[PDB]
Amino acid sequence: ALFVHRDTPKNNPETPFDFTPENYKRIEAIVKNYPEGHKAAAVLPVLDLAQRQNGWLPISAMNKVAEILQVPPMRVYEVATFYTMYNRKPVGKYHIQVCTTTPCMLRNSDSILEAIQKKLGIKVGETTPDKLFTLIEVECLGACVNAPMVQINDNYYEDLTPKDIEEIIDELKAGKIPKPGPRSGRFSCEPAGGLTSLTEPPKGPGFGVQAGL
Amino acid sequence: PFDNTTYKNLQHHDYSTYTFLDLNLDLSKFRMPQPSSGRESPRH
Amino acid sequence: SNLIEVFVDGQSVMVEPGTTVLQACEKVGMQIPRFCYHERLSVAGNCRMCLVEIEKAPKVVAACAMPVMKGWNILTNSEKTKKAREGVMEFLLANHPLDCPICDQGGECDLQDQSMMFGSDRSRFLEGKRAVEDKNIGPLVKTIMTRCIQCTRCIRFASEIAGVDDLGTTGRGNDMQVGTYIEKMFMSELSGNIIDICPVGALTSKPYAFTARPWETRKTESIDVMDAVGSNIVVSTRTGEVMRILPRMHEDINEEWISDKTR
Amino acid sequence: KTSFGSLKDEDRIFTNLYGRHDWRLKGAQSRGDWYKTKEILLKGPDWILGEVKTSGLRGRGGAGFPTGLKWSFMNKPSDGRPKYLVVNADEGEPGTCKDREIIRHDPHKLVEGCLVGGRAMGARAAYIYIRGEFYNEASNLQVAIREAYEAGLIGKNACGSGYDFDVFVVRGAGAYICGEETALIESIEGKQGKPRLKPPFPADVGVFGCPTTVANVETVAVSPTICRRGGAWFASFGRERNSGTKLFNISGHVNNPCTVEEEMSVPLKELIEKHAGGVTGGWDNLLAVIPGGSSTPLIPKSVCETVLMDFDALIQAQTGLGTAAVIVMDRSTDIVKAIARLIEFYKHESCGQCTPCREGVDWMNKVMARFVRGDARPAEIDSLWEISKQIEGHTICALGDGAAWPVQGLIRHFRPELEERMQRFAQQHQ
Numbered sequence: 011a012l013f014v015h016r017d018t019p020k021n022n023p024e025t026p027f028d029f030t031p032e033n034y035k036r037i038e039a040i041v042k043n044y045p046e047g048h049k050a051a052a053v054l055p056v057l058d059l060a061q062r063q064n065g066w067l068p069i070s071a072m073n074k075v076a077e078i079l080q081v082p083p084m085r086v087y088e089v090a091t092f093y094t095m096y097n098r099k100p101v102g103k104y105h106i107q108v109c110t111t112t113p114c115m116l117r118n119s120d121s122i123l124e125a126i127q128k129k130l131g132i133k134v135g136e137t138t139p140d141k142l143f144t145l146i147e148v149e150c151l152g153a154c155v156n157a158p159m160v161q162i163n164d165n166y167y168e169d170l171t172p173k174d175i176e177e178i179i180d181e182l183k184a185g186k187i188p189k190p191g192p193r194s195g196r197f198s199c200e201p202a203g204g205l206t207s208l209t210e211p212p213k214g215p216g217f218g219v220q221a222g223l
Numbered sequence: 224p225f226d227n228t229t230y231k232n233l234q235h236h237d238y239s240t241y242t243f244l245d246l247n248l249d250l251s252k253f254r255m256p257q258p259s260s261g262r263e264s265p266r267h
Numbered sequence: 268s269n270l271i272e273v274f275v276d277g278q279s280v281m282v283e284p285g286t287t288v289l290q291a292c293e294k295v296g297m298q299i300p301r302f303c304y305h306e307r308l309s310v311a312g313n314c315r316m317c318l319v320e321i322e323k324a325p326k327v328v329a330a331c332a333m334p335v336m337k338g339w340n341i342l343t344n345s346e347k348t349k350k351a352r353e354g355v356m357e358f359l360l361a362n363h364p365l366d367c368p369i370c371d372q373g374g375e376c377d378l379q380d381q382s383m384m385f386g387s388d389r390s391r392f393l394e395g396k397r398a399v400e401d402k403n404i405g406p407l408v409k410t411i412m413t414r415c416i417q418c419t420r421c422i423r424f425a426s427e428i429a430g431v432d433d434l435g436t437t438g439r440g441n442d443m444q445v446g447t448y449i450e451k452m453f454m455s456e457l458s459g460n461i462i463d464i465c466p467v468g469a470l471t472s473k474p475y476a477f478t479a480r481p482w483e484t485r486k487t488e489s490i491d492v493m494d495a496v497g498s499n500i501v502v503s504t505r506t507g508e509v510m511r512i513l514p515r516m517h518e519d520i521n522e523e524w525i526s527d528k529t530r
Numbered sequence: 531k532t533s534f535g536s537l538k539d540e541d542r543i544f545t546n547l548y549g550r551h552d553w554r555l556k557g558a559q560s561r562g563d564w565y566k567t568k569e570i571l572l573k574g575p576d577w578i579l580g581e582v583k584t585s586g587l588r589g590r591g592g593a594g595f596p597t598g599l600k601w602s603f604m605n606k607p608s609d610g611r612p613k614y615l616v617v618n619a620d621e622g623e624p625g626t627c628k629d630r631e632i633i634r635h636d637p638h639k640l641v642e643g644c645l646v647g648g649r650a651m652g653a654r655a656a657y658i659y660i661r662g663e664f665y666n667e668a669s670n671l672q673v674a675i676r677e678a679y680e681a682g683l684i685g686k687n688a689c690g691s692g693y694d695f696d697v698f699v700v701r702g703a704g705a706y707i708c709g710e711e712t713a714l715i716e717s718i719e720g721k722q723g724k725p726r727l728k729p730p731f732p733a734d735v736g737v738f739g740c741p742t743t744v745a746n747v748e749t750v751a752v753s754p755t756i757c758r759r760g761g762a763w764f765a766s767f768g769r770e771r772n773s774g775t776k777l778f779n780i781s782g783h784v785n786n787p788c789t790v791e792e793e794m795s796v797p798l799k800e801l802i803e804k805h806a807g808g809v810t811g812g813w814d815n816l817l818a819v820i821p822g823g824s825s826t827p828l829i830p831k832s833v834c835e836t837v838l839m840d841f842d843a844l845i846q847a848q849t850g851l852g853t854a855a856v857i858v859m860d861r862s863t864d865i866v867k868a869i870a871r872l873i874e875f876y877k878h879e880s881c882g883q884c885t886p887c888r889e890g891v892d893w894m895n896k897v898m899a900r901f902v903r904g905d906a907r908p909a910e911i912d913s914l915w916e917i918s919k920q921i922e923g924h925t926i927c928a929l930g931d932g933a934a935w936p937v938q939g940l941i942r943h944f945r946p947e948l949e950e951r952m953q954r955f956a957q958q959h960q
């Protein structure tokens with residue numbers, strides 16, 4: 011929760027960090043997306059790559075991003091503390107993110123938050139002692155019509171009930187993988203009582219195209 | 224056979240952690256040569 | 268010439284294209300209040316104290332950053348200009364600590380002076396304030412970051428003039444903290460000049476700390492001899508004892524800086 | 531035309547919105563996309579700008595700036611710097627989840643929109659700044675862009691027109707402020723997502739210093755359909771200066787929260803009672819509606835009866851159209867708790883740069899946290915109003931405006947509820 015750094019024995023510039031050679035090829039592909047002389051524009055992807063290899067960001071991933079992109083290390087520290095995805099502490103293997111903004115709070119996201127809390131035995135901001143689940147509380151995740159919803163590491167779980175989220179936590183503990191979708195009857199975002207629109211077939215190429223084209 | 228009942232977007236069940244970056248690495252060859260500012264960085 | 272005509276409170280002034288609103292008002296002798304604008308740093312536009320009404324325009328503009336367009340009448344003393352100044356001074360004094368007696372900037376503070384001049388005289392803030400963790404950036408600059416008004420003259424100085432690139436803002440929002448993010452010792456050859464351009468007592472002089480107070484110091488304008496640059500300085504004394512050394516502005520030598528040896 | 535709504539499926543731009551057809555290239559070409567794209571490229575920049583100015587398309591990001599006038603700011607010869615389209619795909623607005631649906635379900639439509647838009651502005655490439663939380667949507671879009679490169683539709687010799695155009699996708703990293711166009715430019719440039727001041731507009735100094743147009747996913751993706759169907763087709767729907775179709779996100783206290791494409795000037799009551807299945811508990815159970823996502827002030831049930839869901843009829847309802855994200859709040863809602871959660875969102879998503887937002891949004895959240903409990907006195911209401919008026923128009927970007935506006939809407943429509951909250955606090959605590 012802090013935005014200063016103190017050197018612990020598990021988080022210091024002598025903590026080992028190095029990319030894999032496939033990650034170096036991915037970094038080179040990232041750097042080739044930006045103009046020559048603006049390599050600093052690859053700070054946000056590569057550092058996110060340093061979170062995908064490691065799960066979090068010690069202060070050796072930030073310095074390695076600062077080293078391979080030829081940017082000052084404070085300019086990577088700023089990015090790593092500005093953005094909310096960069097875990098500057100070691101989070102669990104399944105990082106549960108419950109959206110509790112107003113369109114999800116109107117559809118009772120607190121029930122699912124308390125369901126995860128009493129299911130896992132932790133509260134908001136903590137990690138289960140088997141290092142498998144970190145529960146924090148996030149802002150609007152862009153799934154507002156599928157409210158309420160959570161996010162687990164990449165995957166949205168939508169239209170949730172407390173029974174559905176207990177089922178998802180049970181199959182995360184079981185070593186399987188859950189299905190990232192709305193757990194109600196609908197598929198993505200449609201009205202649940204049938205399609206109120208887009209029921210006709212799509213008209214195909216050349217429909218309504220103006221003349222002189 | 225016209226179908227308006229099945230959700231055809233089942234591919235994102237099969238995405239891993241490096242899927243976006245491997246798609247970027249595959250797309251690295253289809254792209255135009257980047258413009259240059261004339262210097263290696265704004266600190267050069 | 269390609270000089271364009273603008274107006275400050277009706278009075279005409281001829282300016283080069285690229286002149287800001289603040290410089291255009293400077294050319295007729297009015298100093299628009301500011302905290303983050305410095306004429307030797309880059310334009311940040313992030314304290315919003317220079318918000319000023321251009322007439323026939325229903326929005327205040329950042330005078331440090333907005334260039335003048337031809338025919339503008341800058342209303343530096345109008346009603347919404349003063350309301351904007353009082354609102355911005357109110358937000359600056361929302362979370363600012365009641366440290367003025369125990370602060371080395373008291374009596375030489377920009378925030379005190381243009382709070383007396385351009386702000387309100389009382390508080391509507393009925394909440395608790397923030398408290399920011401202090402930093403250790405060396406044996407020269409005493410750091411009390413609760414007083415920081417987040418104007419980023421730290422960062423613009425250490426980047427552009429000092430060439431260090433090691434001060435910056437971590438966090439986001441009200442939790443945004445200016446610092447090095449690590450236990451780092453900001454010791455450049457020009458590291459004491461951030462004591463100058465910090466408008467508040469967030470960055471003070473650790474040798475000068477607590478010993479004097481600006482109104483009782485006599486100002487003797489003198490010359491540096493610590494090298495052959497010949498930096499113009501102010502030896503400020505008090506009762507026959509040298510209290511500190513400030514810079515004088517000289518455009519051809521030291522523009523308004525001095526080294527740490529001098530200071 | 532006088533009445534609006536009831537848009538047909540033959541007039542939809544976003545066919546396959548719901549994911550029911552194939553999102554890939556053989557599915558997109560079979561629904562009308564990538565048809566006669568070479569002719570649209572070869573008829574020139576000024577023809578495409580005239581088609582967008584004819585269509586009356588306004589900025590779908592939420593402000594509604596005229597898209598033809600906006601894109602014509604780039605219609606000028608080069609000065610050595612490249613030119614860029616940048617497609618804003620963050621969509622962090624609470625209530626708004628439509629650009630996720632466009633990226634996830636009609637991705638090639640967004641790619642063809644990038645091609646048409648960047649051709650109209652003479653741009654070199656496209657940077658689709660997608661939100662980082664939309665990771666599966668981003669990989670979805672990258673599979674589509676790989677299909678577009680392997681079919682020769684973009685890249686070197688895009689659609690066989692001799693025009694070169696790349697499409698880049700940059701993920702975000704979890705900051706709502708990075709949806710604002712200059713803060714998005716700063717986030718692309720590898721810096722903190724802090725908004726620049728305007729001037730310079732991005733058409734003069736944008737990404738990397740280049741001329742740049744930042745435009746929303748919806749205002750970019752409808753541009754091939756405008757270039758194919760015509761400008762008069764898109765101007766045939768909605769009122770004057772309110773032309774076209776619009777994706778709507780009706781969420782909150784409705785029976786069926788959904789995204790639906792609909793004609794522009796549709797009534798709010800007709801939209802909710804037709805596509806969303808009505809308010810939970812009936813229409814008399816309606817308390818308030820936030821019409822366009824959290825940046826717009828709420829409107830009560832007496833305004834929601836006859837209001838039209840376009841720009842000007844919501845300006846006349848002293849709110850904004852915004853992203854056309856309808857958040858429905860029933861009579862059982864603690865409405866001050868919802869607006870205070872919203873102001874809490876605005877202080878957690880605020881980049882801390884200039885003084886009024888950095889200080890006043892946290893100070894408004896503290897006042898709203900006391901207003902939920904009632905731990906205040908009524909003279910602090912007008913005080914809070916003035917605090918909003920010290921943020922509105924005194925900030926760098928409009929997140930300060932978008933945080934002052936919900937407070938103003940809540941005070942303006944529910945001052946008696948605030949006052950009875952505080953006086954019952956006063957009677958049961960003093």
Ligand SMILES: NC(=O)C1=CN([C@@H]2O[C@H](COP(=O)(O)OP(=O)(O)OC[C@H]3O[C@@H](n4cnc5c(N)ncnc54)[C@H](O)[C@@H]3O)[C@@H](O)[C@H]2O)C=CC1
Nearest residue numbers: 591592593595621622623626709711731825852853927928
């Ligand atoms: N879609 C979303 O997720 C969100 C949308 N919004 C909406 O965004 C709006 C506020 O955003 P802003 O872009 O700051 O407001 P708006 O005033 O600035 O600007 C919209 C567009 O018009 C252009 N523009 C306007 N005047 C111009 C001029 N004279 N010269 C050149 N370009 C000009 C700007 O470049 C910009 O791209 C609100 O309506 C709000 O509802 C707010 C938050 C989230």
Ligand SMILES: Cc1cc2nc3c(=O)[nH]c(=O)nc-3n(C[C@H](O)[C@H](O)[C@H](O)COP(=O)(O)O)c2cc1C
Nearest residue numbers: 589590591618620621622709710711745746928929
């Ligand atoms: C705080 C803030 C956040 C914004 N977030 C987004 C966003 O997430 N997506 C978007 O398309 N526009 C967003 N906008 C609007 C943009 O400034 C800009 O108007 C838009 O992205 C592109 O312009 P357009 O409306 O012509 O499409 C935001 C504006 C502000 C002030």
Ligand code: SF4
Nearest residue numbers: 366367370376467468
């Ligand atoms: S910095 Fe200025 S306003 Fe703040 S405590 Fe010191 S003298 Fe007072």
Ligand code: SF4
Nearest residue numbers: 415416418419421465
């Ligand atoms: S410490 Fe002083 S100079 Fe640095 S950002 Fe804060 S107020 Fe500005």
Ligand code: SF4
Nearest residue numbers: 882883884887925929
């Ligand atoms: S008003 Fe808020 S969101 Fe905008 S530049 Fe300032 S701190 Fe950032």
Ligand code: FES
Nearest residue numbers: 109114150151153
């Ligand atoms: S409000 Fe929870 S996803 Fe937008």
Ligand code: FES
Nearest residue numbers: 303314315317331
């Ligand atoms: S002086 Fe112009 S905003 Fe700080």
Ligand SMILES: [K+]
Nearest residue numbers: 462465467470
């Ligand atoms: K100082």
